[PDB]
């Protein structure tokens, strides 16, 4: 049956932590998709799929957008899409982590912050998670498609301007975290996070950053990064997750957006079209049979 489509989502989850087995069992009930979802350790929020047949498949990864800054009118930094074609062998296990949006600073359910949103530290949006599609070979994870998330918007961001998409296809380059300042940089592919507000690398579990203690100790405006890798927010915006996490400003500059992450496509696979910011919310993965 080559007409089959498997659609991977957040299974209903949002924020810096990913979903449970019971959420995905609910979201995927009465479909062709069945998955195993880790409960603990670095694989906790990650969905495990079994490839049904040896064949060529389309795999399109979409990462998550970063949050809004200090004004309801701002546009978000949309997550990056990465479309590839891959040959897979029956019974391969694919591990899938669907990125979750960075926390918005606006709108707010607090009517005292909502005043600000409609017209000091803490207005910047959170970083937002990348989407990861990888596989195990010899016990070490191997990446196939990583669709970076979008950096968070600064509290006082004035222009809806964003930088061109970055795509790597070279494992020898290290997939490190982005720089953190007052705001958390984005989680990369393999690193050692130690700050509370920086996004975690995938192999650490990819939990999204806490917001900055400068914000949370005094004013209480919370903007966390998203599953997986989303950097925490301050006045500055947080960096988005990727193979390499997007950078956050070195100071708490309120005009400085977090950078998007760097995406990744295995060179053994075939890229279909350049990477492109399209996603306005959470991420997504789509898998179909390919006609050749």
């Amino acid at each position: 049956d080559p007409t089959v489509h498997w659609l991977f989502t957040t299974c209903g989850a949002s924020g810096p932590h990913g979903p449970t087995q019971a959420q995905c069992n609910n979201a995927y009930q009465n479909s062709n998709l069945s998955v195993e979802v880790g409960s603990e350790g670095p694989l906790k929020g990650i969905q495990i799929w079994k490839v049904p047949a040896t064949d060529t498949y389309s795999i399109s990864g979409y990462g998550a957008a970063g949050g809004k800054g200090g004004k309801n009118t701002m546009m978000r930094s949309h997550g990056v899409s990465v479309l590839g074609i891959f040959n897979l062998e029956k019974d391969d296990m694919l591990y899938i982590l669907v990125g979750q949006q960075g926390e918005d600073a606006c709108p707010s359910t607090n009517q005292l912050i909502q005043k600000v949103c409609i017209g000091w530290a803490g207005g910047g949006g959170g970083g937002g998670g990348a989407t990861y599609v990888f596989k195990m070979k010899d016990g070490v994870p191997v990446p196939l498609i990583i669709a970076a998330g979008g950096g968070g918007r600064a509290y006082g961001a004035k222009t809806d301007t964003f930088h061109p998409e970055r795509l790597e296809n070279n494992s020898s380059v290290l997939g490190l975290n982005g720089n953190s300042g007052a705001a958390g940089g984005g989680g990369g592919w393999n690193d050692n996070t130690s700050l509370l507000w920086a996004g975690k690398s995938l192999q650490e579990g990819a939990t999204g950053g806490h917001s900055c203690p400068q914000a949370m100790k005094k004013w209480g405006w919370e903007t966390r990064g998203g599953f997986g890798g989303g950097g925490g927010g301050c006045s500055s915006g947080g960096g988005g997750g990727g193979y390499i996490g997007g950078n956050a400003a070195s100071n708490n500059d309120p005009e400085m957006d977090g950078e998007d992450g760097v995406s990744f496509i295995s060179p053994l696979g075939i890229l279909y079209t350049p990477a492109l910011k399209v996603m306005e919310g959470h991420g997504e993965v789509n898998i179909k049979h390919y006609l050749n």
Partner: antibody
Amino acid sequence: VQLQQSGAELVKPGASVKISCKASGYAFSSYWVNWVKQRPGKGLEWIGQIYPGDGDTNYNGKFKGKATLTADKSSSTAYMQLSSLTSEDSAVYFCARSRGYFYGSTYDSWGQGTTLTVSS
Amino acid sequence: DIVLTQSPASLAVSLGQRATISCRASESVDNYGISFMNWFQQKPGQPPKLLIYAASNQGSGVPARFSGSGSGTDFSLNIHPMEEDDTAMYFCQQSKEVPWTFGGGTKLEIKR
């Protein structure tokens, strides 16, 4: 969002207790945890607070060295240890989370309370 | 300390009637354009529950009959119309300056 406290304690004068407050459903390291004492026929008393992220503390001078506040990030648990107990320490003790300036720096989520009784 | 003088200590009210509780502070509790006066309800055997934060703002799921007023050193909690389920202790509270302090409380009881 839940704070869940440990059970009651009945102890002799001179002893110590350590009351636990286990947090869930939010980022333990980003909010202040407050402690409050309530006795019959009295109001509420603020004992102090702790910020688990970096161990910062603020005390009510009336309770310094009587209450000792700590936080354990591994378990997301806030403790209060009461030393050199007397009959004036017999009370119900609450832990409570507070939010920042935008929320009036006020409490928004309370443990169920812990009853201490001190008698010889 | 910032001392809160809550009045009255006891108050009896018929169903439907207006109940007014006052809290006066020894110094202004305004800072950054916010008033750090807050109001709480506590029934027997329960922890306290937030009614009003920053002097004027409804807490989540707090019915409309509760409302807070004031700024600086004078503040007020109004309940109207009074319902049976409002009998409880009521406390004011400031967070402007350490140490955080409570008013002395008001016990709200039914009149007969």
